[PDB]
Structure formats: C-alpha cells, structure tokens
Ligand binder design. Structure first.
Ligand SMILES: Cc1ncc(COP(=O)(O)O)c(CNOCC(=O)O)c1O
Ligand SMILES: Cc1ncc(COP(=O)(O)O)c(CNOCC(=O)O)c1O
Lengths: 413, 413
C-alpha cells in the first residue's frame, strides 16, 4: 500500500461533519469550542503591535521559541508551579496545545508502550497514541443536579491499569468535555502511581484559568517529586480567547524535553514569530496585573461563570439535566430521560443514541451540542451514550438566541 | 529507555555551533536563509489587515485551510500546473514548507521503504525519512565560472537507485544549497523513472519565484502522468520574503492527499487563521499584477539577481570560486584552493574541511557561510568537503559590510 501503517484506524475524524452541521441551518452553535466574541483589547493590540513593529519580526525566530515568550513563560509559570524554569531547556513553543500533545506523544510513545487515558477524554489522545505505536488503556471516571467533581477516579481501577508496559498517563484538568477540576487528593493519587511505576504524566492544562466556584487549578507538576516526570501543556488560544492564534507550549525537565525538541526540529522547526510576540506581550500584561481585579485571569472566569449559570438554568427548562462543571468552556447534560421516552431516533446500526439525538436536536430544535460518545473508547460508547456537550463561552446575544430556541422547544415538549 | 526509537540519530543539529559562533563575533551573516530587509509593503499590510479586521479571524478556521487561501492556491497554481485543483481535496495548508515535508513523510514513508534523495539536499529530508522508518538512498549531482546548471543528474546512476522498495523520490527545485534549476529534460528523466517504478515524487518548490538569467521554473507535476503521483510544496515565507510567517502548502491528488490530511488532523489540526488571510491577500495582489512590471514576482528576482552578481564578483576578490546559481537564495563557492594552501585547520575527528573553514572564516574574517557538507550523506562528506554556501538575499548595507570584510581579508593572508 501507498500510505504508512501508522495511519491505520485514525482517518475518521467526526469534527468536519460537526462544523458542517453547525453553520448552514438557522442554528445556535453551542458545539464550537471557541468564543464568538473578541479576545480582550490588550491581546488584539499585542498582535497588532507585532505585525507593525520591528520589521524583522516578519522573519524566522529561534527554533524552540521566541525568546521574549519563553522568558515570560518560564518566569510566570515557574512562579505558579513553585519551580525554577530554564527558558532554553524547560520550555518549548508549539503549534497550539494540539501540537504540544503531538510532540509529546511522538517523543515518548513507542511500539508496544501502554498509555493510560481517562474517559471522557479529549478525542485526539487515542489516535495520537495509536499513531506512535502505543496501546491505549482506558480508565473511566465513575458518574456519581450532579457535579463534575463527583465523577470519581477509582483508586483500585486506576491502580490496576498500571503495568510494566505503561509509558505515560494523560491527565487533562480542567477536563474537556466534563469540566472536572482535579482535586489535590486526586492528583496525589495519580502522582503516587506515576512515581511507583516510573511513568510520565502528560498533563493537558489548556483550561487552567477557567475555574469556577472558588475551585483552584492545581498543576500535578507542582507536587513533590513530579517535576522530573511531568510535561505540562498550555494554549494561548484558551488563555486569551484567541483560538485562531494556535500558539501553545510544553513545560518540563530537560531530560524529557530534549526529546520533544528533537521531534520539533524534525517536524516544524520554527513556530511563527509574530503571534509568539503577541502572546509574550499578553502574558507580560497579565503577569503585571496578577491576582488584581482588573486582570483578565480574574475577570474572564467570573464572566464565564455567569454564562455557565445561565446555560444551566436555561437547559433545564427543556428537561436536559446539566452536570455542573467546576472548570473549562463546557458542561455536559444527561439526556437519559429523552433516550427512555424517545429511543427510536433514526441512525446507523450501532450508532450511539447521543449522536442520533444531536442530529435530531440540530435539525428540529436549532441547537448544536457535541455527542459525548466521541470522547470514549469505542467499546464504551454504547454504555456512555446519553450525554451531550455544550459550550457556554459565548456572547450574550448567542445565549439570548439559545433561550429563544429553548422556549420554542418547551411548548412543543 | 524513555524516548521513542524513531528519534535515534536525529537529535544532532550541525547548524547550532555555527550560529552560536556567529553571534559572538562582529560578523556579516551570509549564512541566514532569510532576508534582512522588510517584506514588500503589500504583504506586511495584508497581515496588518488580518489582525485588525473581522474579529472572528482571531478564532479557529477550517482544519485543512483558510478557505480564501485554499481558493486562491487552487486557482493560481492550477493554472501554472495545467491542472484542475479542488481546494478541499487537493490543497492542504501547513506550518511552512517544513511542516508540509513532515506531513508528506509521515503519511507515506513506512518501515523499510526507500526514499531517493538528491545530493546536495536540504538537510531535513534525511532525518525526516529516518524518523518515519524509511531508508534514505542517495544520488549525487556531479559537478561540472561554473554554473549550477552543469551539475549533472546521471541517468544511469539515478535509474540504478530505484528498487521495489522505493516509496518516494524527493525533488527540490530550485535547489538549496546549489541553486540549480532543473531543466525539462532532467524532469522528464525523473518523471520517467517515477512512472516506471510507481514512485511518488515529493517536490519541494519553495524557491519557485527565485529564478535568474532567463531560466524558467518547471513543475514536475505538470508533466504527462505526473499529477497523480506528485506532491508539490510551497512556502509563503520564501514567496513574500516573510520567513517568520511559517505558512506553506501541499498540492496533489486526493488519493495521496487524503493521507496527509490524516496526519494533519492528528498533529496540528488547525493552522493559524490570520497569517493565512495575509497570504491569501498577498497572492491576490500578485495574481492581479501577474507578469506586470510592478509585480513582486517580476521585481524581486531581478533585484536579487543584481545582489547575486555583486556577491559573485566580491567573493572572487579573496579567491573563493563561485558557482553561478540559476535560482534560490543561495550560491556556493568552491574552497579547494584554500584546502590546498591551508590544509591543517583545527577541528574534531573526521570533521569535514568545509566545517573547519567556516569556523576559521567567522573567527578571523567576520563572514558567515554554511558548510555544504551538512547537505550530504555522511559517507559522501569527505568527497564533498570543499564547498560553502552563501545567501545573497540581503540589504544593500549588508553587502557593503561584506565588501568591508573582504577588504580586510588579505592582511592576515
Ligand atoms: C483539552 C484540550 N487540549 C488541547 C486543545 C488544543 O488546543 P489548541 O487550540 O491550542 O491547539 C483543546 C482544544 N479544544 O477545542 C476542540 C473542542 O471543541 O473540543 C482542548 O480542549
Ligand atoms: C528547500 C527548502 N525547503 C523547505 C524550507 C522550509 O520552508 P519554511 O520556512 O516555509 O518552513 C526551506 C527553508 N530553508 O531555510 C534554511 C536554510 O537556510 O537552509 C528550504 O530551503
């Protein structure tokens, strides 16, 4: 055959369809994981500055990162992590969080390695693991209005997934799609098993600043003994509400990072210069206002908490049952009552109910959500088929349009 | 061990010690493959427009490319290639030419496949082949002031490199580092063998617009039968003198391109939105002014041809022997007369003479060039140890500074 066998089984990607259904019909798109309002002024101005400043910013910068950006990443996150971070040895700038993940898997995962993934998971973890020759091993959070915090990571289950073949565990907190914010106890559980079995924790923290109800983001790399076995990933797009900038980073110790640098230099070599300058300027702004009321990292999550609360109240009007998230852009609603009363929606054989339900909801109610079964291993999709994911990081006008659709549903319902 | 075996042997980067040595001395940097003058106003303006326009340009665009960009790529290059190009199936936007190359190797090259590489080669072709499990197979152009045109691709030698395991051949024209522009006859030779053995031609055309002395860029995908077995790669950075934008593309038939799409959706998923908009607007400008005196693609090569001629004359004053390039940012000079008169330069074991010479030249003469042995397979570096690469796409002030260094050259010797 023409194509490499590393591509086996990872050519199906359901997002192309999801994005297609999302725009053409007179619909309210609560499926897209990006804001439909502008980034903050200081961020847009930072990018404007980068493309209207030193003309040499139009040319290549340093391979492992624009130095003003690695400098402030190392400064600011070293403070948050309680860690001294070397910008040249412990920081790599990437093409988004997505590229950061890809770089980590290609650096570390080899044929026959096991990778522990926690369900529900951001869907790329599985095919990225597979492309690198890894064997995904799944542990399912146990469902306990419900709260994301009560979805339990069972210690005996998680412990039994660790083997001599375990290379890495992928921890996503705050979690997409569930909105769970991992507690110190849960991180200590993961940390102890990673230390016991000599496993690297790849930790996806792109939603770090999106935490609600006084819950604290805790980075596992800040725990005792974890810096030397953790990679910590962030995203400028989720941090500054500018998802189209596609700038990300990995933080971690040199002995691991050198292998991500090897992947980087043999794949993209440089990231764009001017978006990196914009991101550096943006972090410098937030660092100087850190913990103050006028800082974006205080204002924004407080705003989005109000949007979350609005959506939670509104979706209940139609009998959807939200699970209250403690963080992220997202919440999920249980649709088990609809599956019970309306089981026979059209769909393919072995098509999970939530995919069928979303198609029905888009066409007939004018609302877009994402079926949560895409965030499960295929064998578990039949058992976790009754949730859908909504995004509440939306303009007030959009949430008003959501309420118009919901009011029309209710009278029908 | 911790890291994946695919990284074996590809962490060494020979550029680093020269750029490190470069920054320490008061030097004229003719090693940098980028302009030290601004991109053209219309290109810089286009990026300014994109970051100060529709605020939704700050959010994600479509996975396989910003649609106004894939539209103009497909229109503009379809005409040049004599091919109907569909934006959705035949175009992929990538993170530079680098990212495009990476995507092609990861899609097509598998354990045990052979990949034919033409020496001197842009240096990533080898480690990218290796990381995808392929086996590089090398064919050397034979050196014929000399002209890059006289470096011959021997028909018998080339034909003998093809085997049942040949997956692809990598064609770079115009060539970095040599500046050779492949003739129709040379491309018909490569096409004939690729059709005979069923081999994909990966064709790196990033220097397409940089052609001199009446020489024409010919795209191999335009030859009979070749569109269905060719991938054509371009770079906005080499096209609009904006290397820090890091936007590239691949063009090709769906039956191959679908596999690059699979790699893309499992590695970066999106390219940045606003640089893509800038590139699209820049191409629209050139399309409207195609073949007209005020067009960049007319003006810029003519201007850089004068810079080339200036550099050729200047470097000769010191006993360097230039080979006149027909295209690209680069020219090479033979340093054989220096190896005869000064054979015993300091260096490590088996360190090729040209690498030692460049270090000597940086430290004693204040000029930076790149040793051409980095563009050769290791077994061939001893034979091909007497060329260095200069970049003449430079500000008039940089060329003045070069001439000042050349005046001060003889005093030592
Ligand atoms: C957990 C997680 N990690 C990483 C990423 C990627 O971040 P970036 O945009 O920086 O590449 C994302 C982006 N999510 O957007 C897709 C969705 O609607 O589910 C993410 O959610
Ligand atoms: C042949 C070739 N292909 C691809 C690329 C990559 O293009 P991009 O910047 O678009 O990723 C380059 C960039 N070369 O600059 C490095 C050097 O001085 O040798 C290139 O020369």
């Amino acid at each position: 055959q023409l194509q490499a066998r590393r591509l086996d089984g990872i050519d199906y990607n359901p997002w192309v369809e999801f994005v297609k259904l999302a725009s053409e019909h007179d619909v309210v798109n609560l499926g897209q994981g990006f804001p439909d309002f502008p980034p903050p002024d200081f961020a847009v101005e930072a990018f404007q500055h980068a493309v209207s400043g030193d003309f040499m910013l139009n040319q290549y910068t340093k391979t492992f990162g624009y130095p003003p950006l690695t400098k402030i990443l190392a400064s600011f996150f070293g403070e948050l992590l309680g860690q001294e971070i070397d910008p040249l040895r412990n920081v790599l700038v990437t093409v988004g969080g997505y590229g950061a993940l890809f770089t980590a898997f290609q650096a570390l995962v080899d044929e026959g390695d096991e990778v522990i993934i926690i369900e529900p998971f951001f869907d790329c973890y599985e095919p990225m693991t597979m492309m690198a020759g890894g064997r995904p091993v799944f542990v399912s959070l146990k469902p306990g209005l419900g709260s994301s915090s009560n979805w339990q990571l069972d210690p005996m289950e998680l412990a039994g997934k660790f083997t001599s073949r375990t290379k890495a565990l992928v921890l996503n907190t705050p979690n997409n799609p569930l909105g769970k914010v991992f507690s110190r106890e849960e991180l200590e559980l993961v940390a102890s098993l990673c230390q016991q079995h000599d496993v690297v924790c790849i930790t996806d923290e792109v939603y770090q600043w999106m935490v609600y109800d006084g819950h604290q983001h805790i980075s596992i790399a800040s725990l005792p003994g974890m810096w030397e076995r953790t990679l910590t990933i962030g995203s400028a797009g989720k941090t500054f509400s500018a998802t189209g900038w596609k700038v990300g980073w990995v933080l971690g110790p040199d002995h691991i990072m050198k292998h991500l640098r090897t992947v980087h230099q043999n794949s993209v070599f440089h990231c764009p210069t001017q978006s990196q300058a914009a991101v550096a300027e943006s972090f410098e702004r937030e660092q100087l206002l850190f913990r103050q009321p006028s800082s974006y990292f205080v204002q924004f999550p407080q705003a989005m908490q109000r949007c979350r609360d609005h959506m939670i109240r509104s979706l209940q009007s139609v009998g959807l049952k939200p699970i209250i998230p403690q963080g992220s852009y997202f919440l999920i609603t249980d649709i088990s009552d609809f599956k019970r009363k309306m089981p026979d929606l059209p769909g393919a054989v072995d098509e999970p109910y939530d995919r069928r339900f979303v198609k029905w909801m888009i066409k007939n109610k004018g609302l877009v959500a994402i079926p949560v079964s895409i965030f499960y291993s295929v064998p578990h999709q039949k058992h976790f088929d009754h949730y859908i994911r909504f995004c509440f990081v939306k303009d007030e006008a959009t949430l008003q349009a959501m309420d118009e659709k919901l009011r029309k549903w209710k009278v029908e319902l």
